[PDB]
Amino acid sequence: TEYCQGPCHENQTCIVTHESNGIDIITALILNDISPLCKYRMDLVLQLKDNASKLLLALMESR
Amino acid sequence: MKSNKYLTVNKRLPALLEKNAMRVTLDATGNEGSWLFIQPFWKLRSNGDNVVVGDKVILNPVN
C-alpha cells in the first residue's frame, strides 16, 4: 500500500503486471475466507480483508 | 452404480485377513449400519460447511 498508495504510477504497473499471481492472491485474500483463522478469531481476517481492499484501491488511484 | 449395491460396514465382522479390523462390503439393501458421516478430515471446511468438491472428506462409520 505505502509503496503505491500515492499516485506513484510505477509500483502499480510493477505489481499488476507481475508473473507471480500476487494480484490474484490479493483478490483471493479479499474474497476467500480464512477457514481456520476466522472460526477461532474473526478480527484478523477482517483486518486482512480491509488491508487488501486498501491496497487494491491504492492500485488504481489517478489512472 | 454399476453394482447397484450400497457400501455398508459390518462392524462386528473381521476383515479378510486383518487381525483386528472391521469389514466393509456392498449390501443390496443396507443393514441399518450403512450410514457414513462425512467429517472434515481435509481440515479446510468446518462442521456443517458445504462438502467442497475435491475436499479431503472423511467418510467415517456411523454405526
From Swiss-Prot, chain B:
Localization in the cell: Endoplasmic reticulum membrane; Cytoplasmic vesicle, Secretory vesicle membrane
Q: Which residues form the MIR domain?
A: 1-47
Expression tissues? Expressed in intestinal crypt and villus epithelial cells.
Q: Which family does it belong to?
A: Belongs to the InsP3 receptor family.
Q: Which disease is it linked to?
A: Charcot-Marie-Tooth disease, demyelinating, type 1J: An autosomal dominant demyelinating form of Charcot-Marie-Tooth disease, a disorder of the peripheral nervous system, characterized by progressive weakness and atrophy, initially of the peroneal muscles and later of the distal muscles of the arms. Charcot-Marie-Tooth disease is classified in two main groups on the basis of electrophysiologic properties and histopathology: primary peripheral demyelinating neuropathies (designated CMT1 when they are dominantly inherited) and primary peripheral axonal neuropathies (CMT2).
Its biological purpose: Inositol 1,4,5-trisphosphate-gated calcium channel that, upon 1D-myo-inositol 1,4,5-trisphosphate binding, transports calcium from the endoplasmic reticulum lumen to cytoplasm, thus releasing the intracellular calcium and therefore participates in cellular calcium ion homeostasis.
* Swiss-Prot/TrEMBL domain comment: Composed of a large N-terminal cytoplasmic domain (CD) followed by a juxtamembrane domain (JD) and a transmembrane domain (TMD).
Q: What is this protein called?
A: Inositol 1,4,5-trisphosphate-gated calcium channel ITPR3
> What is the species listed in this Swiss-Prot or TrEMBL entry?
Homo sapiens
Q: Which gene encodes it?
A: ITPR3
Range within the parent protein: 127 to 189 of 2671
